[model samples]
Target: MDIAKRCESNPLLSPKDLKAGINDMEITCLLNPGVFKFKGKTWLLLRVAERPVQQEGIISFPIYDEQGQIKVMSFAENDPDLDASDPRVIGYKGKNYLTTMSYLRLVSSEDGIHFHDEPGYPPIFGKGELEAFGIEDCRVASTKDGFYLTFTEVSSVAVGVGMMHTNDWKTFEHYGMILPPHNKDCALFEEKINDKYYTFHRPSSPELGGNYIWLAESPDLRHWGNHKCVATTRDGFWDCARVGAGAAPIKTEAGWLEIYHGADFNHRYCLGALLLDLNDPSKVLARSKEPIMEPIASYEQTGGNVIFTNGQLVDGDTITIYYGASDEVICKAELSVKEILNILNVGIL
Candidate 1:
């Protein structure tokens, strides 16, 4: 497949910025940044995931205690159940744990090649009861009405979808959680087809089916219904482990062009596409047999071994994609709409 690369100019905002008088092993921060365009500028809403540092000769990690608050546990090196072995996921007392507190940081660029950090606009941190743990995987959808922001709202009780909107990025209007627990990876279609809004989401069910993309229609953007399963993992393919919608689906004369992310059993993330009907919106037109972009670069593979995307911007016929690399740094890729449609137009075998 054909694509274009623009070196991230990355580590866009690392844990260092969030570091406040914290030591090395204890200091934790930064992951899953989303990209978009606003006010004639390219913007990146970075997910800054953080936790406290660990101590020497001991394991001090963050966990939700019985009362459901973030508590630190320190255990001796020889102690069992303190399996700090895997960086990807935590396992303690046979129960895996995750300490994630995400804050949305805004950065901008004019040329789309170079971006600069904006300090005036304060980073949007998680709020209220639902955000006890923090937010994650935010995808920006800019539509004719306004900017539709959707992210994962994480707490002890539920992990659901949060919705917020802002025409001016500075002042945001929070509409609270739009979808219930165990749902995320929401990509709102840029335009409504047949006077109805459409969105793509991933609803996880460990028992029935794995994490797969689902489609829904709404008269209003928030009150969504008529859920339909759109795509599922291919068991032995690149999207075997799970798949989710990335960024917002772009509207084209031919169909709705959707850029999405997928992962295999190894947990390596990659990018792919799917085409949907313009009139029905939920109608599947074409889907990519393979990932168009994957963790090929050393930076993409080495850091966290995860390459995820939350946003992209369109410039005429060119699609400028800004994605997270290795779950550590931000990266960019570009492809012409003509090129993407050309590839999608090709009959999948």
Candidate 2:
């Protein structure tokens, strides 16, 4: 039903909007930003991706070394051990490395359309071995404890979700990799449920369990258990490939309404909704029969037909989504909470 209304000034942010973080690297793509409001300004924790400028016959990229330092690695295009078929990732010598190193940079907007960098606010770079490939797709959960950042921590070892909490964006308390490898797309709920913390995560096996959304609870945000598989992909459908949670779930009168993203085999991403029981969130109340938003713009067709959102600003009835279009640039869209609730296929479980 594609109910999303894209902002007239779409592509609100891009690689050209921000400068490179390192000396030799250049910003390649500005991706999914974690949307939040800070000190009367709408803020975005941008995932700014950077890589070495390409050469005529060489493939080069940067990564965080073991000592947590930036290092550039280059290889000839005809190297027999190299496989650079994928745009983002490269396989070489039986190990995978990202073509670009990602970091969370901060930007804010007064009108929520035109964004600019906030000076003095340092960007959060990847630290330690867990994030050697860098971090991507951060989801901000603004809570009473401050802002909890749940993001994908990518490395050669594996891909997992990491945690960090901050009140004043200048300083942060990192909780390490809360969820182990093979897991990403983790979003902590804004509020507690029955005095227990709740979150949605995805842990997958390439050929087994599949990439689906799973729910869990924790007394403390660090230790999570009591897992339950909530949503899975549909065969021969728009979301036939995989699915994952977005920002935070909306606490609506109907239930906890979550606007999530799904994709097909072609990697064309779309947005859908999942309704969980108000009291017991493990129970699935409803799901979207079809996508609510689909990639249909030129900006969304550059790398792939994709519209992946990990950040949103929710008001009374409207949700302002700051999405990464084609994994390249940041854009904005809006959806009504009431309209999404009305369109859900209730009681499918």
Candidate 3:
């Protein structure tokens, strides 16, 4: 347990450090980004959460219409029909709406530590009917054809996984919702296995099933099927409440090393590892009994007990993980592959 070595530079990026894309809006949180390498630079496609500046007696937020235009909605703070108890969510007449909207913005760094927004690449906002609420938690996978993006499309109706193809990062070809409503937290393998593309996704059922990781296959990266539950939350464990995939799984000689996030009933989030068979990913080889990374520092402990990872860069045996701490700021950590493999040996792999 606690195998991760946190970076001294964390909270690497904060909401205060980032400027809002729009004039009237303010940055609320700098969430985990979709990490990748492009044109010899390390790039982070950050999920920027933004909202209108709060007023004394008013609650305001932003939303996008069918034409992708931003519009503000406001309600009186004292309105009997409105419940503004949660800072992140507002409830009104048995319905819910987010206090802030999220979109993807690109930043790059020559050295992995410091990053800033790039002027050439504009911020990506949610468009069309599927993203009525907003888009969040993007995971990018690079292949020979291009980079495949799997992100959570949020709306009042439901949440689902949306797909897009981007070769130049300037323009994107949207594939719509690859995974239907009530699903999110999807990651695609970097390479095809047995000539079929493989991915991990979380599908939830409120009455029967919980949030658990499942495996799926796709031939063209657009059509997906053959789903199987690969991992489930354990009762009375650190992940008893729910679990979801982080970044793309790391391919190793031992197995596919997947770094995933799990949360308990208390809403405390942590990071763990899962080992799957190289040939058949659905077969689980091993898993972490305890969290590999937890919320120990002030930044991770301030808002919520969370250390959720979404992006990782592997060089040789060292894995550089980029994660969001307390759902408010971005941070980094380093993990040794050999040490993780050794931990897996506690049972069998």
lDDT of candidate 3 over 140-213, digit per residue (tens): 99778889889999877778999999999999999999999899999999999999999999999877788999
* TM values, all candidates: 0.86, 0.97, 0.96
lDDT of candidate model 3 versus the reference = 0.89
Q: Which pairs of residues collide in model 1?
A: 25-53, 25-54, 26-52, 26-53, 26-54, 27-53
True-vs-predicted CA distance for residue 306, candidate 1, Å = 2.6
Candidate 1 global TM-score? 0.86
Query: Per-residue lDDT for 179-217 in model 1, tens only?
Result: 888899988877777788888999999698989889988
Ranking by lDDT: 2, 3, 1
Assess candidate 2 and give its TM-score to the true structure.
0.97
**lDDT for residue 238 in candidate 3, whole number 0-100:** 94
Looking at candidate 2, the ten consecutive residues that score lowest on lDDT are 340-349
Model 1 scores worst on lDDT over the 10 consecutive residues at 18-27
Q: For model 1, what is the error of residue 33's alpha carbon versus the real structure, in angstroms, after optimal superposition?
A: 2.6
Candidate 1 global lDDT: 0.74
